[PDB]
Amino acid sequence: GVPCLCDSDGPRPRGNTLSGILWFYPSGCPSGWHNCKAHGPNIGWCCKK
């Protein structure tokens, strides 16, 4: 998988500008994730654990 930049991708700890992974889920983020970029990308929603 890839880490990507997000929407609230600012006040986050380690990773800060990459503390989220892209997601290949039609329902948004998969079970255990909670989104990072509520704006995409289209190449999988970037979410995080």
From Swiss-Prot:
Q: Name one GO cellular component term.
A: nematocyst
Look up what happens after changing N16R. Decrease in affinity for both cardiac (Nav1.5) (5-fold) and neuronal (56-fold) channels
Q: Which cysteines are joined by disulfide bonds?
A: C4-C46, C6-C36, C29-C47
- Feature type site, description Important for most of the cardiac specificity: K49
The record gives the effect of mutating N16D as: Decrease in affinity for both cardiac (Nav1.5) (500-fold) and neuronal (3600-fold) channels
According to the record, mutating L18A results in:
Major decrease in affinity for both cardiac (Nav1.5) (330-fold) and neuronal (34-fold) channels, as well as a 9.5-fold decrease in discrimination for Nav1.5
Known outcome of mutating W33A: No mutant obtained
Residues marked Has its side chain oriented away from the channel in the binary complex (site) = T17
| Site description Not essential for sodium channel affinity, residues in chain | R14
What is this protein identified as? Delta-actitoxin-Axm1b
User: Which organism is this protein's natural source?
Assistant: Anthopleura xanthogrammica (Giant green sea anemone)
Q: What is the lineage of its organism?
A: Eukaryota, Metazoa, Cnidaria, Anthozoa, Hexacorallia
